[PDB]
Structure formats: C-alpha cells, structure tokens
Design a protein around this ligand. Structure first.
Ligand SMILES: [Zn+2]
Ligand SMILES: [Zn+2]
Ligand SMILES: [Zn+2]
Ligand SMILES: [Zn+2]
Lengths: 70, 70
C-alpha cells in the first residue's frame, strides 16, 4: 500500500550518520525493488537506521540484514 | 527462502523483556502470515525487539510497526 515511512527519508538519515552504511543499504534497496519487494527494502533501511543509531558497525549491520533476507 | 533468523526465537526474546509486546507482535505475525508474508512478519518481530531492547513503550512500538506496514 501507498504511504507509510519513506525509504528515501530513511536513506537520508543513514547518510547523515554514515554514508558507508547508506551506500550498502542503497544497493540492497535497489536489488530488493528489482525483485519486486519495496516493503522489504523499506524494512531493511529502517533496520539499518536503528542499528546505526546504536553504533553498530557497517559490517555487522550487513550481516544482520542478510539473515533477515534469507 | 528457508533459514535465516527464527521468528519464534524473536518472539521468545520479546517475551523475556515484555510479554505485552510479545502479545501484540504475535498477533501481527499471525495476520501477516495469513496474508502470505512470513518475511514481513519476521521483520516486524525483529524490529519490535530492537525497539523493546531500547526501552520503547509497547504503544510506540505498535505505532512504528504500523507505519512500516502501510
Ligand atoms: Zn504499502
Ligand atoms: Zn523500525
Ligand atoms: Zn526466505
Ligand atoms: Zn534487525
């Protein structure tokens, strides 16, 4: 459905905290949209923002996101 | 795909921290599985666990999860 949190807003907030995490998440978002799941893309970006706000390293963020994508 | 983080493990961890949040998440998980998106259910449970570990109130958790479900 339309509406809800903006994936672009989430990506924006990631960029302000760590562009390295924004870059890895933007790539996952692009692939997930191509597989036809924008909501999954939004969950991934939202999750990365929670973890980055708590000081999780980019590599640990990526590992965590991959497990939710299996 | 099979594998990845267990939704039951997440629900278990929610219950240990606040059974009120486990209960509201279990209901969302049941509905999301019925709509044929178990991965969405798992994202919701994982998100609730991050927020509950940070001290977010059950009502604020529910509001946040709903916005990701729009
Ligand atoms: Zn929607
Ligand atoms: Zn969230
Ligand atoms: Zn899977
Ligand atoms: Zn997570």
């Amino acid at each position: 459905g339309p509406g809800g949190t903006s994936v672009e807003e989430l990506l924006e907030e990631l960029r302000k905290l760590d562009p390295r995490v924004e870059e890895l998440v933007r790539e996952l978002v692009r692939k997930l949209r191509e597989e036809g799941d924008p909501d999954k893309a939004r969950f991934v970006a939202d999750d990365a923002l929670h973890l980055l706000r708590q000081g999780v390293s980019p590599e640990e963020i990526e590992r965590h996101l991959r497990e939710l994508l299996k």
